[PDB]
Amino acid sequence: SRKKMGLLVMAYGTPYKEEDIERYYTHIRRGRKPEPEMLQDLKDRYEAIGGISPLAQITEQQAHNLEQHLNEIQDEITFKAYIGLKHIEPFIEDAVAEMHKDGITEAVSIVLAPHFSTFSVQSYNKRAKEEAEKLGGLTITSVESWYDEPKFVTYWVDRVKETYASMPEDERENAMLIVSAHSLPEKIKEFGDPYPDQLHESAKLIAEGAGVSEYAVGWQSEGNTPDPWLGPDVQDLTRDLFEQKGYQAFVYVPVGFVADHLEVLYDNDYECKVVTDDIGASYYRPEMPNAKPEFIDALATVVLKKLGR
C-alpha cells in the first residue's frame, strides 16, 4: 500500500579511524595534504576529545532513527535512508547512485545543518540533483533550511533554560549566551547568501524562548584561505565581551552543529574553555542534539512539512 521514497541524509562527514584523518583533511583543503606537523596536531586533537570512531557513528544513528521514526509516525510512505557525505565516503554521488540502483524513483533530501548557505546546503543539493539527472528516472525534493522548525528551536530553548536554571545566583545574573555556526568565506555575501541572517534569527529565537536578554552571535572553525571568513570568531568574541562588560559565565550554543564532532568537542569545549578559564569565567555548553528522540522528531516534522504531509 505505501509509497516507497528515498530519504537522502547529507552531512559534512567525519573520519572513521585515525588513519582516515589524512585523506579527510586533504579533501577539506581542496587537495592540499596537511604537512606532518599539522597531521600529528589533528591526531592529538581527536585523541584529546576521546577518539574519532564514536563521532562518525552519530550521523549513521541520526539517519537510522529518522527513517524509523518517519515510518512509524505516518502510514502513507515507507522511507529508506541513504547517507551522503561531503568529505568522506559514502559520498553524496555514491548515495544517489545507490538509491537509483535500488529502484528508488522518488526521494526527499535533508542536510544535517539547519541553516541554508551557498557553500554548504545549496552545493549538497545541487550535487545530489545533478547525479540524479545524470542517471535519470529519479527525482529529489530538497529541504533548504530548518533552523526555524519550532520543535528544533524548543530543543535548544529547553537546554539553555536548564543551563541557566542550574547556575549559582551570581552567574545567572551575569552570563553571556554565544550562539554560533561554522564560519564560511565572507565572499558568500556577494550572492546575498542568507546564512549570516539565519544564524542571527536562530540566536534571536533561542534567546527569546529561553528568556535570555544578553546574547551574541559568533562564528567558529574557519578554514585558512587568503580571503576572510565570517567573524567574529567565538574565541575573540568571548574575550571582547568579557573586556566590555565583565561576564562571569559564558554559555555556548553551537546551533549550526547537530552533533558531538571535533568542531564542538574541541573548538568549543577546548578552545573557548581556554579563554573562559583565562578570564576567570564559568564555561557551559549544553548537550548537542545527536540522535535524541526530541531532535529526531523535529527532523521528522521538517521532512513531512516539506512533503506537505
Ligand X SMILES: Cc1c2[nH]c(c1CCC(=O)O)/C=c1\[nH]/c(c(C)c1CCC(=O)O)=C\c1[nH]c(c(S(=O)(=O)O)c1C)/C=c1\[nH]/c(c(S(=O)(=O)O)c1C)=C\2
| Nearer CB in complex with Mg ion: 3/30 | 30
**Residue 40 engages ligand X in binding (rule: CB under 6 A):** no
Min dist CB 208 to ligand X, Å, is: 28
CA distance 300 to 220: 28
**Residue 30 engages ligand X in binding (rule: CB under 6 A):** yes
Q: C-alpha cell of 239?
A: 574575550
- Among 28, 39, 279, 304, contact with ligand X (rule: CB under 6 A): 28
Q: For residue 248, count other CB atoms closer than 10 A to its CB.
A: 19
Q: Restricting to residues 167-196, which ones interact with ligand X according to CB under 6 A?
A: 182, 184
| Nearer CB in complex with ligand X: 25/270 | 25
Number of residues that bind ligand X (CB under 6 A): 12
- Amino acid at the residue 32: R
Q: Is 105 helix (H, G, I), strand (E, B) or coil?
A: coil
Task: Give the length of the chain.
Answer: 309
CB 295 within 8 A of CB 260: no
Q: Strands (DSSP E) along the chain, which ranges?
A: 3-11, 77-85, 106-111, 139-142, 175-182, 215-220, 249-253, 282-284
Min dist CB 221 to Mg ion, Å, is: 5
**Residue 119 engages ligand X in binding (rule: CB under 6 A):** yes
| Nearer CB in complex with ligand X: 48/73 | 48
Residues that bind Mg ion (CB under 5 A): 228
Q: C-alpha cell of 135?
A: 542517471
Binding mask 222-251 for ligand X (x = CB under 6 A): -xxxx-------------------------
Query: Which one, of 247, 243, 238, lies nearest residue 219 by Cα?
Result: 238
| Nearer CB in complex with Mg ion: 50/228 | 228
Q: Which does 29 bind (CB under 5 to 8 A by kind): ligand X, Mg ion, none?
A: ligand X
Cβ within 8 Å of residue 41, ≥6 positions away:
none
- Among 4, 23, 27, 29, contact with ligand X (rule: CB under 6 A): 29
CB 290 within 8 A of CB 260: yes
User: Could you give phi then psi for residue 79, rounded to 5 degrees?
Assistant: -90, 145
Annotated binding site for N-methylmesoporphyrin: 12, 30-32, 182, 187
| Residue numbers at the binding site for ligand X (CB under 6 A) | 25, 28-30, 32, 119, 182, 184, 223-226
